Amino acid sequence: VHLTPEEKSAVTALWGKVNVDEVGGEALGRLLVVYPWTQRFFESFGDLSTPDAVMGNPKVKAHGKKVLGAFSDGLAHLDNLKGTFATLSELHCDKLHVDPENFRLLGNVLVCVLAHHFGKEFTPPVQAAYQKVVAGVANALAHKYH
Amino acid sequence: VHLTPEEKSAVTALWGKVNVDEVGGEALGRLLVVYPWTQRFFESFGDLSTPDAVMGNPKVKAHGKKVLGAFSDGLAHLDNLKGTFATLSELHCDKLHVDPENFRLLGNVLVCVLAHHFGKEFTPPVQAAYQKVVAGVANALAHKYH
Amino acid sequence: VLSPADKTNVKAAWGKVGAHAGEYGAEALERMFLSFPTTKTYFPHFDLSHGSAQVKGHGKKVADALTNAVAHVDDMPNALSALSDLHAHKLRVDPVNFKLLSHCLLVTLAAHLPAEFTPAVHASLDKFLASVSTVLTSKYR
Amino acid sequence: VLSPADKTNVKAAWGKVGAHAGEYGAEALERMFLSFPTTKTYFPHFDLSHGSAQVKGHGKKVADALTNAVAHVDDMPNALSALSDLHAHKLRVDPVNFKLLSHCLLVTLAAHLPAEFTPAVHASLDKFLASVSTVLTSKYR
Ligand code: HEM
Ligand code: HEM
Predict the structure, then answer these.
(1) The dihedral of CA A109, A111, A117, A123: what is its sign?
(2) Are C129 and C6 in contact (CB under 8 A)?
(3) Is A89 on the interface with C (CB under 8 A)?
(4) Domain locations in chain A?
């Protein structure tokens, strides 16, 4: 995407305070809880019956870690998201069959997690910066769909 | 927008048969009937109370001609919709205050009107090419919003 | 939120569809797959090529459901109860997709009903498809 | 539909909001204007600068309306009747915008309710904002 020097720095500064694995398990768990239909891809993960089951599920957490680790690596390439996520875009389309709408949902849940995690530090301008980033990544992941 | 030879060909061939004045009046009229809240931008157009009033309104027809006329010019520059529509984008944001979601609604109504008018000739593949074009145009007009 | 006029417009248009309902359902799916490729992600098990018997079969089921919905326009939630269950707990199609298929069904109706697809009928059918979509997604969460 | 549990969750979170409802309303708008600039098209008559009296006053009205809805969760259509007319016949805000304000309200609560914004509460609030939006947009056509 195109971020002002100021937004890139706001994004980077907050990301340095993030426990990637913790936040990853949390965003993925919340996605499954808030938009239950996204559970359709995780039937092999076991028990997803209640919110507590989802949040405590080891496989959800493991998946959360993987997804957010990729996201994190992505932050080093804000100037080339499309190029960075090309291969993952194709995999998500051709083999995983994930409706890209799910990327948009995860991005909005990630924003809510960051807000919850950081409180007042997650100011309106910082939010705006992150919103462009989550939209950019969702766009990059959906790019190769056909 | 990136269109395959076949899609470009499809779009151009059909456009050659379009009466911009008439199709324009129709698309604008139907937007105001189907999504009545869009009427908020046309308080000075007179009577828009019933479908018959809308469709027969001379200011609607006039405006519809004007809009589709500018749309047509964009067909000549499919390779650079953002640059083609920059000035109008800025106008629609800064002076007219039009929510860009309306561009999306008009795009879809336009598709409905082409199908209505052309019948069987408006095949699935032709529709698909037009959908890419309308999305592109909406994007282009939304581009300079801030 | 369907007025008496909306109900009348819908039964009229759907009446003219008649026996062709299944053909139109198949055509709307095909329009959808081509126009909005992300919708294909829900049908990895289908042959989505033009003329596919699977698309045809599916189109017929969709169309029949719509016929059932028109027949019970004043009692849609009950009539479509098993379908709402099915979509919410098994298929789990993202709600956004219902608007894409609705649009493709309108385009299909437009392409086949020149005389019937007046502005007023277009408005009523869009209202109708939105109502069916609302019922189908009512039990998602 | 809001379950009994959702209703309990919503009442709990909003009760915690208490006296800050107005301040949270103003912050949710500010978040909206910044994150989603196209929503500004509805406020060309406002000074949208940070801490403007107009934004603060509007934030207060929006919060009061939400309190009203929480208070009458079992009869929202009735409770928000006047507001649904206002938005449907005068303001005529495109329905897509309701989703953007809901998201921003969700973010503001998350940022202010560290103890209370659990996964379950988050789900219930999201449904609640979705329901309020549905009510406000019900009379559009
Ligand atoms: C007006 C909207 C819709 C109606 C009336 C409808 C109706 C139906 C019906 C009647 C069935 C067959 C259920 C059975 O086997 O008893 C079905 C299945 C299904 N629908 Fe929906 N549907 C709608 C929208 C959608 C959307 C928007 C999508 C995704 C883009 C979707 C995806 C599916 C899938 C994947 C199946 C299972 C097909 C199979 O494997 O045979 N549906 N739907
Ligand atoms: C839950 C969602 C919303 C609620 C509860 C809400 C509530 C209200 C209330 C209570 C008023 C003032 C009514 C009066 O003074 O009689 C109002 C006015 C207004 N609303 Fe909504 N609203 C919502 C969503 C939106 C959205 C998403 C937008 C546009 C992005 C919007 C745009 C406006 C505008 C432009 C006004 C008039 C402001 C003025 O001129 O003072 N509303 N709203």
Answers:
(1) negative
(2) no
(3) no
(4) 1-146
SS (H, E, C) chain A: CCCCHHHHHHHHHHHCCCCHHHHHHHHHHHHHHHCHHHHHHCHHHCCCCCHHHHHHCHHHHHHHHHHHHHHHHHHHHHHHHHHHHHHHHHHHHHCCCCCCHHHHHHHHHHHHHHHHHHHHHCCHHHHHHHHHHHHHHHHHHHCCCC
Residue D36 has what DSSP assignment?
A: -
- Resolution of the experimental model, in Å, one decimal: 1.7
Q: How far is CA B49 from CA B27, B29, B33, C123, in A?
A: 17, 12, 9, 14
SS3 D5: helix
Whole-angstrom Cα distance, residue C120 to residue B45?
A: 20
Q: How far is the CA of B59 from the centre of ligand 2 (A)?
A: 30
Report in angstroms the alpha-carbon separations of A92 from A21, A61, A100, A140, D51: 21, 19, 9, 11, 44
Distance D42 CA to ligand 2 centre (A): 9
Q: C32 with C101: CB under 8 angstroms?
A: yes
> Would you list which residues of chain C are within 8 Å, Cβ to Cβ, of chain A?
37-39, 41-42, 44, 88, 91-94, 96-97, 140-141
CATH number for the B1-146 domain, one of 3.30.230.10, 1.10.490.10, 3.40.50.300, 3.30.930.10? 1.10.490.10
Cα A88 to Cα A82: distance, rounded to the nearest angstrom:
10
CA B107 to chain centre: 5
Give chain C's domain count: 1
Q: How far apart are the first and last CA of chain D?
A: 22
3-state secondary structure of D16: helix
Q: How was this structure determined?
A: X-ray
The answer to whether residues B112 and C118 touch, using CB atoms and an 8 Å cutoff, is no
Neighbours of B134 (CB within 10 A): 20
Residue D48: which domain range?
1-141
On whether any CB of chain C is under 8 Å from the CB of B25, the answer is: no
Q: What is the CA radius of gyration of chain D?
A: 14
Alpha-carbon distance A82 to A124, whole Å? 26
What are the angstrom distances between the C-alpha of B34 and each of A65, A76, B37, D87? 46, 46, 9, 17
